[PDB]
């Protein structure tokens, strides 16, 4: 009736190297049996698993409001720049894997 995929914000996150970099992932779950995954695109335009919630430099924390999660790169390096998304693997109702639209992390020289 009003549906949204998992939100991954911001679409462009620009930090200096050594800074922490924190994306926000939003997923409105209609059940409790799901896991939330954080991914980075391989150069093959494919998908590698960085971290999940429930579960070292990539961490996912679940915020109090039951919707939002924080995926943070600790002390971002310059080879951290690339494509990122989150995805919501929910088994019921209807067993779906829902991926956010991609976001760019851009780590600029210090």
């Amino acid at each position: 009736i009003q549906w949204n995929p998992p939100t991954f914000s911001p679409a462009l996150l620009v930090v200096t190297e050594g800074d922490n970099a924190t994306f926000t992932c939003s997923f409105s779950n209609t059940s409790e049996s799901f896991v939330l995954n954080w991914y980075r695109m391989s150069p093959s335009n494919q998908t590698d698993k960085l971290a999940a919630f429930p579960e070292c430099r990539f961490r996912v924390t679940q915020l109090p409001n039951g919707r939002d999660f924080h995926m943070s790169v600790v002390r971002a390096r310059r080879n951290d720049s690339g494509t990122y998304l989150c995805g919501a693997i929910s088994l019921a109702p209807k067993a779906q894997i829902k991926e956010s639209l991609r976001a760019e992390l851009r780590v600029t020289e210090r």
Partner: antibody
Amino acid sequence: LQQSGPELVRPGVSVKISCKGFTDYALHWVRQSHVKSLEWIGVISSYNGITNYNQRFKGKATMTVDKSSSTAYLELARLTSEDSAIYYCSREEWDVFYYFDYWGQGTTLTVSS
Amino acid sequence: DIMLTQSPLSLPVSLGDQASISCRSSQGIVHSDGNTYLEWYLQKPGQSPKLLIYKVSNRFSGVPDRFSGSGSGTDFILKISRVEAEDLGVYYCFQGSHVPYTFGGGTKLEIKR
């Protein structure tokens, strides 16, 4: 899609039936009683073991998966003459729009003294 | 819980007549997706149920063109135009939009004579 053979056990004991296919689906258990009324028991994820149970069958049913063997288990505990039924396993693909394509043959379970 | 009540239990027909089985739910079955995951299954005696119609109207491939699913809101209809030796059995609707998933009570399609 190949389940354990038929079982005849006494009230109060437990039984474990098996369903053998793997990491691409959700696996469901559906029980069909002797009035031919189907009921959904639960779903298990082969690759995470995460579960969702019909609350009515929580505690009467426990779902477990072994991925090396590519086999799922339903354990029925504290058994009673109501659990006499045909127990089917069936699967559902992840990102498709339909549920049960292929079924197991079913495992007929009788509980009596 | 979504209880699915079907009418009638027995539908007598001549092979080639027009019979329609109806499925009614106690509340709306629209999933978070906007999709309505309602299905129709046909069960021949001694075998697993087989998927015929998924979503509301989609026929699964392999399924004959005469089985037409439709419906909306709280109301759904399975219609069979050409009714066959291979069509007799018990038809169940099913909703997969809200856990727990639930089946209708069944409708037995029989030969009138």
